[PDB]
Design an enzyme around this catalytic site. Sequence first.
Site, PDB file in Angstrom:
ATOM      1  N   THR G   1       0.819  -1.207   0.000  1.00 48.63           N
ATOM      2  CA  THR G   1       0.000   0.000   0.000  1.00 48.63           C
ATOM      3  C   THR G   1       0.856   1.261   0.000  1.00 48.63           C
ATOM      4  O   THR G   1       1.997   1.252   0.459  1.00 48.63           O
ATOM      5  CB  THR G   1      -0.947   0.040   1.211  1.00 48.63           C
ATOM      6  OG1 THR G   1      -1.840   1.151   1.078  1.00 48.63           O
ATOM      7  CG2 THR G   1      -0.164   0.167   2.504  1.00 48.63           C
ATOM      8  N   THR G   2       0.298   2.347  -0.531  1.00 47.49           N
ATOM      9  CA  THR G   2       0.984   3.627  -0.594  1.00 47.49           C
ATOM     10  C   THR G   2      -0.021   4.751  -0.398  1.00 47.49           C
ATOM     11  O   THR G   2      -1.153   4.678  -0.888  1.00 47.49           O
ATOM     12  CB  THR G   2       1.712   3.802  -1.929  1.00 47.49           C
ATOM     13  OG1 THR G   2       2.460   2.618  -2.223  1.00 47.49           O
ATOM     14  CG2 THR G   2       2.669   4.980  -1.860  1.00 47.49           C
TER      15      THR G   2
END
Lengths: 226, 238, 237, 237, 216, 140, 203, 248
Positions: G1-2
């Site tokens: 995730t970012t």
Amino acid sequence: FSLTTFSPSGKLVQIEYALAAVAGGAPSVGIKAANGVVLATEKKQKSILYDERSVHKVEPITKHIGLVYSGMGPDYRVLVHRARKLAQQYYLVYQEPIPTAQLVQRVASVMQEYTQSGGVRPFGVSLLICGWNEGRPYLFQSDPSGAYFAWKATAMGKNYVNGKTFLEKRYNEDLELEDAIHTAILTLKESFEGQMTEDNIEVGICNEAGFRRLTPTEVKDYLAAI
Amino acid sequence: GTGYDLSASTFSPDGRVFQVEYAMKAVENSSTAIGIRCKDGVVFGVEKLVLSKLYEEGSNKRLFNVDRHVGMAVAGLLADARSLADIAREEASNFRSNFGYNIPLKHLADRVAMYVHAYTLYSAVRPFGCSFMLGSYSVNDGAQLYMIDPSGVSYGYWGCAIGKARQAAKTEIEKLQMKEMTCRDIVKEVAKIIYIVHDEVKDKAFELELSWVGELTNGRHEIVPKDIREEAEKYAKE
Amino acid sequence: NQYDNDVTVWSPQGRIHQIEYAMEAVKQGSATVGLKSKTHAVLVALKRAQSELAAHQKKILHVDNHIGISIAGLTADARLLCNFMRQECLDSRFVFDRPLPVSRLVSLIGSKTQIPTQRYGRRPYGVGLLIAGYDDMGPHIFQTCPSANYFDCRAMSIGARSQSARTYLERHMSEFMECNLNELVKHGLRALRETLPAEQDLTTKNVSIGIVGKDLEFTIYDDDDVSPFLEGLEERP
Amino acid sequence: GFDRHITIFSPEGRLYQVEYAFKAINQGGLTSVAVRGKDCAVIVTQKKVPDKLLDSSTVTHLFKITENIGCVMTGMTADSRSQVQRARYEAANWKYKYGYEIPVDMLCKRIADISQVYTQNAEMRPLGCCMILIGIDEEQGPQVYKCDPAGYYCGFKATAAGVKQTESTSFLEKKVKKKFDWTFEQTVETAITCLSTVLSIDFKPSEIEVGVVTVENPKFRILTEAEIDAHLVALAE
Amino acid sequence: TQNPMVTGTSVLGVKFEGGVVIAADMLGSYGSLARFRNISRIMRVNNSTMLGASGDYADFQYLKQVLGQMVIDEELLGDGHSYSPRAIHSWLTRAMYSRRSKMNPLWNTMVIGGYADGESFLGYVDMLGVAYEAPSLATGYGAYLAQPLLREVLEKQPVLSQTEARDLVERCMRVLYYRDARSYNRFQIATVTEKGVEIEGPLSTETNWDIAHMIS
Amino acid sequence: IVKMEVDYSATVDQRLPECAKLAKEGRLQEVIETLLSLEKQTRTASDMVSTSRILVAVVKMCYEAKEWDLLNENIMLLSKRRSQLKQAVAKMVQQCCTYVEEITDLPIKLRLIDTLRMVTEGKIYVEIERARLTKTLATI
Amino acid sequence: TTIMAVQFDGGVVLGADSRTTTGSYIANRVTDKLTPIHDRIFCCRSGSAADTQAVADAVTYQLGFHSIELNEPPLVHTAASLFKEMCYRYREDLMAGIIIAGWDPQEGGQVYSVPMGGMMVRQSFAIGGSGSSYIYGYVDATYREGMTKEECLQFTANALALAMERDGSSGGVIRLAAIAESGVERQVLLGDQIPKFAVATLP
Amino acid sequence: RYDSRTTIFSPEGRLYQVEYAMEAIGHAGTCLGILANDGVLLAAERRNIHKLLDEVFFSEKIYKLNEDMACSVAGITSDANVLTNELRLIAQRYLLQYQEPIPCEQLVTALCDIKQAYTQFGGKRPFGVSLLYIGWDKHYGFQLYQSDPSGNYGGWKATCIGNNSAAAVSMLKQDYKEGEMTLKSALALAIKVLNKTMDVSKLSAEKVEIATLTRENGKTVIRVLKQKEVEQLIKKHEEEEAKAEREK
């Protein structure tokens, strides 16, 4: 001091005053019929400004335990909230007994935080409880200091004396079917001053199928043909 | 009252709290104060009775600093007033620690007022014998000034006065035309009003404690430089 | 009078009555004076003796090298305040190795004593305090009354018949900043001697002195330590 | 005795402390009206501002408890603010514990329970402020409720509270008995004319502060000077 | 607290005649990562005392908040007194010692500079509660690299001038940037003197790489 | 009745005759509206003489420009807007009484009944009733 | 995730991936990581999903209550202070990286970062999450000053797209949130709409 | 000034609050316990017999408190309920701790200790309730105990605790014979004394509730005599009365 207190030589003066307050004025009759129990009460709101579908006098504490009360509605709430929490705790501990009538006696007994721990000021409400999860119905009364009375028919209103007299004279009896609610409405009629109507009168029934607060439709249906 | 005016927890037959009704009397008896919202700030002022020349330079000053930008001008029972000022300082510090930045004056007044009301609600504790103005300024919210009575609630004030002579002060306060007058002329006028109020007619000589907050001080509620406001006191004298 | 019974209750006429009675506790006590200077703070306390056999009791209590107090009033809840002040000063020493400035100490005492004035079942600390300290801003004299409203003073006295001492201190207070240590101590001695009746007079056994200066840490002089100050008394009882 | 001094049952079988506390609401000199409508619920109270040194911006008696519930207080302002803070705390705590927003009836029930606890016990005292809170509830339309110093929470369609509450209730009873629903104009005009007939001052559009919650527009619109002026012009036409 | 995540690299400082100068670069090292390059590790304790820290920047922010709050509370009383930098150093020392005793240590090594009563003071306190004052101080790899230069300068010159002192600090910062992995070429330099505390800002040091041609 | 807040005597003196010139024949209603705004300002300032003068000027303009219907709805709006100042409305009714008696016309009966409806909202014994009596006699 | 935030003139733009990983299995490929703390304040969560959700909900509690008691929209700085306090007091138990952003009339578009540890910092742009460590060079090189709303939107979308395509713990769809005085506009980029930099390595 | 309760002495030195409560115990309620060989029984007077009750609790005065004992209160029902609950809790706690039924004397001592504490310290009302206990143990066999609100219990073998307790105990003293006493003659004595202390002759079996504890083969059986058995006892008593009266 910080409990049910003020007991002089052979008296409970504070408790007696509490009962004088529970004399109240909401008749709130109860009848234990063979099939089940009926708790009927009078909702005589001041003026038409107030609402009747907003607040209720009959509260289902659980699946088949219904509850009606007397004077001091603010105290009665708190009491019914405590009763709901107590029945729920019992059901959670003894898991899944569908506990209503083997729990009606037990909840009436756990109605000791009701009054044996008054809270400086004792509660000012006497409440009738109905249950039918034993194959048999149960109607109990708990008063601002006493305990489970196990009535068959009674009233807790301003004219509770002649209400009870009416109940016994009209023979609460034992063979009466579930539709002794007609007799309950008659008993209210006696302690009622007005053309009672569906929103004016609130009644709950607890039969072996469960408990249910009768909606104004059925209440008006029963009030018709009286 | 007689029977019902013993503990704040006992309501009056008419429905009043005579403990607070009497705690207001101590504020009515103690020496007065005043606070005016100038155009770009708030200027306080309070005469202090030097009960004896044995005392040093003005001590137990009716002014206090509750936070960096907030000031409290109090009147009434001074000891409980100081304890309440400490409560206010603690509240401001806690708000700064939690939410950062500076505590908005309306919220600070509301919180200290709720705290005061907590002390009049019960029976074991007694209502505070003090009434105080909280004044503050910031660029974002302008200048605000809220007065808290010994039991009541904060109210927004363009100009307020409390203490021995509230009406006498308020008449000339309302005579004064605020909202367009700078904090300098306001600092002159508040001293003028205090000196118009009786100081030695029945009492001793009085000291003029004056406080500032505003963009001229970029916030930073501080006592006005007394050396340079001695001339303002002189103008008040005339 | 009903409204005078309890500290919490508030009189209809205004201020409460129990606090006003609490000041009478300090009124009913042996006299003490305390005066500042340009550089020294001096306390002169009349050590009240029970009987000639018994000692003259203890006054001018010790708190720290730079702070010393003089009690006047209810001795019971006075050693308690002395413990509190000693503890706070030692706490300051422990946390940031600097003598606790007196003004902060007096504010702490005021806040500490304010609470019993509002908490039910708690009597106010009916003790008159004359704190003498030397912070960085020269000598300081503070008076703490049981009403928890402290005061700063150039020279203040508390105790029985202390009004005469107050008047003498007021009339001579103009010449207080520029006085040698002995001159100021003799000022205080004259002020205290003017308190007690003419039959009484200062003795080395019934007086105590507390001196704190810039280079002189707080010291409690008495009889022997006192005689050099007691000399040149200029006795006009 | 002390039957009428503490929160204990009277020998006659009554509770005199709360009976007194209700009259505290009438004390303070104010009135407030709330009218539920066909779709909206509008309330209005007079804004008694003595002298203009006050800030009419902050003298109000109506507040937002949450994004959809608006309350009007009546009685002592300190207790009113305390109960408003409690109601806001309850709304936020409810939104935290359960995802959906707190229904107005449930909020009034919790406030009433708090007040009932207050009238229980003897250490504390009931708060002398009656609160009328309104809000739009889905599957319910507009909803208005009133919590009182006792703990009895109810009140609907048309309910009023304050000094001259009985006259307002009588007029509103006449209006509701007149069987015709109020649209988002008739409701406001009805509330305005009710309060004006109670306190005939013709209501310059600066001395009342009205709050409105419609169904198509949720939220507690504290209607501005221009809006109340427009409603007054339309009514007096 | 127990395991820092964003750590601030070294900070140093030297006292001179009439004032003190400290320097800290503006990098927040998330381990081997230069995550935050525009953060200030120098705080103005008051008008006459400065403070820098190396280590967990979150802990540094907490100490900054607490110490600023206590300074504000001290100045609110208006008693004329203040928290002398000696007292500030003592207070930080105890705080750190209390945290280690509670076994919740503050992962910060702190340098406290001040100039009060006409005499400069330059304190030092670490995570383990070890504290003292020396004319020159440095933290972490600073105490290994920049400190020897300060020591050898001060051995021959017990007293220092401001201009050459800040030049020495700049040279030490250049050395630290040259030979420290966690360092960065953007440092703030804060000077405390009788006039107060003045922070220069995002100063940078010039890099030399002529020796780069000495590879072959 | 209520204390005067902000007088506009200078404003009315400097502007009202100029407004009359600008609408000499009454073709402009923006003038009527702006004098309505001015008298509303003076009413919120609780000034009686300025409002009375404004109303008298308005009815005088209606007289000179002989717009009988626009007079009827104009005086209806003036009497029904918020009730204004009882002194001012009693004045305006008095000059209307003085005017309706000089022009015979057919719809002066309509004018009489219009003023009767404006005055019959109450306030009979208080704030001039001789006007209503004279109007009824004129209707006779 | 970012997760990523950018501040522009008069507002901010937030971009987050929709993937939440558990070991090597995709627990939720459509995760909604842009939690609205208030009307004009948003939160981007990274790390322990449960801890992030709990912290965000508690802060939403406190912030909504605080805004109601002030009768004024809260400051993004105040929200970031609430997050930093919550994270710092429980850092040893709570391990979460949070990116806060929003718009308030007091200052305008603001962005703050509170990573694990409980530190607060104000940045022009913020970047965090597992997949953040792979686009640092790109986000630093391709960021201009005074970028407008569309420029920031496209640039953040690109940065999230590359972080997703490179990091193994990031994937699914992209959620963008533009916050300004006008309000908040949330959009989703999915499938073909994802800005793709194809890597066609020659045979 | 604040209200303070009365747990204090008398100028003489009496605890008149406790004495008033103990005397009030005589007012209201009526129970009696008679001890006999191979069986000890309790008789209780049904105060309120309104026809609108249903009698579903199966017991109002007599309470089963343990496998080997049963008690009977004569005080305020509010305190009686909590006292019975505490008594059962004490007995069962002993059973848990020692894996053995609790001796009756130890049980009664625990209960009277709790009542003594309630009258001893704090601003708490004395437990206005006095109760009997019948039990069987391994050490002393059938035992009967009477506890007053004063906490000063006593080991009785034929006693009453109700309103006309004086008359009942006088009747018991007159017609009580130890040793010869057996279960059936004990029942006859109990019904006779109840008929004496209840003014209306020919007591209905509904107005009287009686429970007998007996020792079966290594097991204690506490049987509450139901309506038919009670009225058969009544009929036998009536036959005895008629015979004795007519034979003169």
